[PDB]
Amino acid sequence: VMYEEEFTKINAVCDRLTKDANAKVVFLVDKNGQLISSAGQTQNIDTTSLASLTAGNVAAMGGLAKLIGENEFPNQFHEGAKDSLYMTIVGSRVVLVVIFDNRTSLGLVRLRIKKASDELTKIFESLV
Amino acid sequence: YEEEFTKINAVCDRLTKDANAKVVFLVDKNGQLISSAGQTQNIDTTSLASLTAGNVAAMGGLAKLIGENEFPNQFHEGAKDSLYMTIVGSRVVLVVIFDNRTSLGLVRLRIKKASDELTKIFESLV
């Protein structure tokens, strides 16, 4: 009953996503604010504080979606000057955060995020 | 009463029509609703303004964490309707809710024009 094995698969998805999508840093945050996984250039970034602020944003967005008679917004894109941010809700419990340089193709990051999200959904569904 | 306030509502009304938006809101970062235009009817405007402020504050801290200035434009994609948030003069938030059938490039171009018009109004307020 030890998985353990399923958590290593989660980190592998994050590591592959950072390399394939050519992302700067990748995070997996639970809606309760807990950091599940992180990959890439995690040095010089407060992972704990990032997870807490992600949860606060997603919770505010969730309540806002319900107010307009809409289901939770699955994808959130925030464009910056040098680096951009992408957020994807995986199975309405987990948030996949992807930080990448603006020079990287938006179509490329989105295509890889979809593959990562689908891989993660299958892992979280095996966790009953 | 207040010529500048009528100009603010006019920008929101023009934005709803021109960008073909469902509903448009103007929220202060402190959670106060400034203006609203469009299909405001079955939406709790006070609760929307409070949740917008909470989200913008979390997003502001998230931008600072990644060594970036506050994101001027925040996009949240849905199944039927999408949401757009634009920070006007780092004090006011312009919330635009629109159907996914509307062009993303069209909404963004109109939001920029509305934001520039609003910045000029808020700067005349001293």
Numbering used by the authors:
A (entry chain A): 6 to 133
B (entry chain B): 8 to 133
What do the study authors state?
A hallmark of all motile M. xanthus cells is the accumulation of MglA-GTP at the leading pole where it activates motility, while MglA-GDP is found diffusely in the cytosol. This localization pattern arises due to the GAP activity of MglB, which is located at the lagging pole where it inactivates MglA-GTP and depletes it from this pole. The ability of MglA to hydrolyze GTP is essential for motility regulation. To gain insight into the structural landscape of M. xanthus MglA, we determined the crystal structures of MglA in different nucleotide states, which uncovered that MglA can adopt three conformations: inactive MglA-GDP, active MglA-GTPγS, whose structure had not been determined before, and an unusual conformation combining inactive and active features.
The MglB crystal contains 20 molecules in the asymmetric unit, for which we applied an original strategy based on a low-resolution envelope derived from another weakly diffracting crystal form, making it one of the molecular replacement structure determination with the largest number of independent molecules to date. The 20 monomers are arranged as 5 tetramers, which resemble tetramers seen in T. thermophilus MglB crystal structures. This tetrameric arrangement masks the MglA-binding site and would thus be autoinhibitory. We therefore analyzed the quaternary structure of MglB in solution using SEC-MALS, which shows that the major MglB species in solution is in fact a dimer, in which the active site should thus be available. The C-terminus (residues 133−165) is not visible in any of the 20 independent MglB monomers of the asymmetric unit, indicating that it is highly flexible. The maximal dimension (Dmax) of 96 Å is significantly larger than the Dmax of the MglB core that is visible in the crystal (73 Å), with the SAXS envelope showing additional volumes extending the dimeric core on each side. Thus, the C-terminus is a flexible segment that enlarges the volume occupied by MglB. The MglB dimer features an extended, positively charged, convex tract located opposite to the MglA-binding site which is conserved across bacterial species, hence appearing well-suited to support intermolecular interactions that determine MglB segregation at the lagging pole. We mutated K14, K120 and R115 in this tract into alanines (MglB3M), resulting in the removal of six positively charged residues from the surface of the MglB dimer. In vivo, MglB3M fused to the Neon-Green protein was stably expressed, and displayed a conspicuous diffuse pattern that contrasted with the mostly unipolar distribution of MglBWT. These experiments thus identify the region in MglB that supports its recruitment at the lagging pole.
